[PDB]
């Protein structure tokens, strides 16, 4: 139904292997789309369908926004530590924002800072003022909310415009590939024996991410057995799920795996 553009910033006080001090990825609704990091400071597409769609103009525009947000964030991680009295240690700061387009003309948005795995400070969407989660984000709350800075009215003008303008535009470019239904192969197996039997029900290769797979005995829902919905991703669009069921105490009789996915009608697979 709805579609979302959204950006994720991660900034750290000391780098490590794999991590640059600062880096960005932006999702367009499920696909990873944009990328930037502080080693070789450049904004890149991250998916074929963003390649060769916007000119050199754009991108250098984007690389400059990113090269500007980088130092103010390395700075903020050192400031945050100070409000908490920390001198040693590695520390992280995380930023999230995004717009959601939906329904008819409905717009929704969010913008939040997180210092370590804890929410620090965040924007109320109808009131349009930043509300801290913590004492230490009171001094931030006041700088930003003040008349002279007025960050609520600035980000409001981005969240209600540029973000959606850019969303609408990127949805266009990835139109052919974002709705694109691809549907599940399914491969039942049943590990081992002894008294009762295991029964794995492997579905794979599908898009979108959402599915439902039960084990049905004749015409009644079977049993839990562990994990629950662990829909795993593949390194394309595709997704994957496996449901297990400890069964036959001894009686037998016609088990079956009921898949229910957005490319279908029903789909039902029999025993062995």
């Amino acid at each position: 139904g709805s579609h979302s553009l959204r950006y994720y910033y991660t900034a750290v006080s000391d780098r490590a292997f794999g991590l640059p001090e600062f880096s960005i990825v932006g999702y367009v609704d499920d696909t990873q789309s944009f990328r930037y990091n502080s080693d070789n400071q450049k904004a890149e597409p991250a998916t074929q369908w963003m390649k060769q769609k916007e000119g050199p103009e754009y991108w250098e525009q984007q690389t400059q926004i990113a090269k500007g947000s980088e130092p103010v964030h390395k700075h903020d991680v050192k400031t945050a530590m100070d409000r908490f009295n920390q001198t040693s240690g590695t520390h992280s700061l995380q930023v999230m924002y995004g717009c959601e387009l939906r329904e008819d003309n409905s717009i929704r948005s969010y913008h939040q800072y997180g210092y370590d795995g804890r929410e620090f400070i965040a924007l109320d969407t109808e009131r349009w003022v930043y509300v801290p989660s913590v004492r230490e984000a009171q001094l931030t709350e006041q700088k930003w909310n003040s008349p002279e800075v007025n960050a609520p009215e600035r980000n409001k003008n981005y969240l209600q415009n540029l973000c959606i303008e850019g969303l609408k535009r990127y949805l266009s470019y990835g139109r052919a590939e974002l709705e694109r239904r691809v549907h599940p192969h399914v491969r039942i197996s049943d590990h081992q024996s002894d008294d009762a039997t295991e029964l794995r029900c492997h579905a794979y290769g599908f898009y979108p991410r959402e599915i439902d797979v039960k084990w049905v005995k004749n015409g009644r829902a079977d049993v839990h057995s562990e994990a629950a919905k662990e829909i795993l991703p593949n390194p394309d669009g595709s997704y994957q799920l496996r449901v297990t069921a400890e069964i036959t105490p001894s009686e037998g009789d016609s088990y079956a795996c009921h898949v229910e996915h957005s490319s279908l009608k029903e789909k039902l697979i029999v025993v062995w």
């Binding site: 400031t79 800072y113 981005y158 540029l162």
Partner: peptide
């Protein structure tokens, strides 16, 4: 497009 910069915290 991504958000301009933001103030230092």
């Amino acid at each position: 497009y991504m958000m301009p910069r933001h103030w230092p915290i």
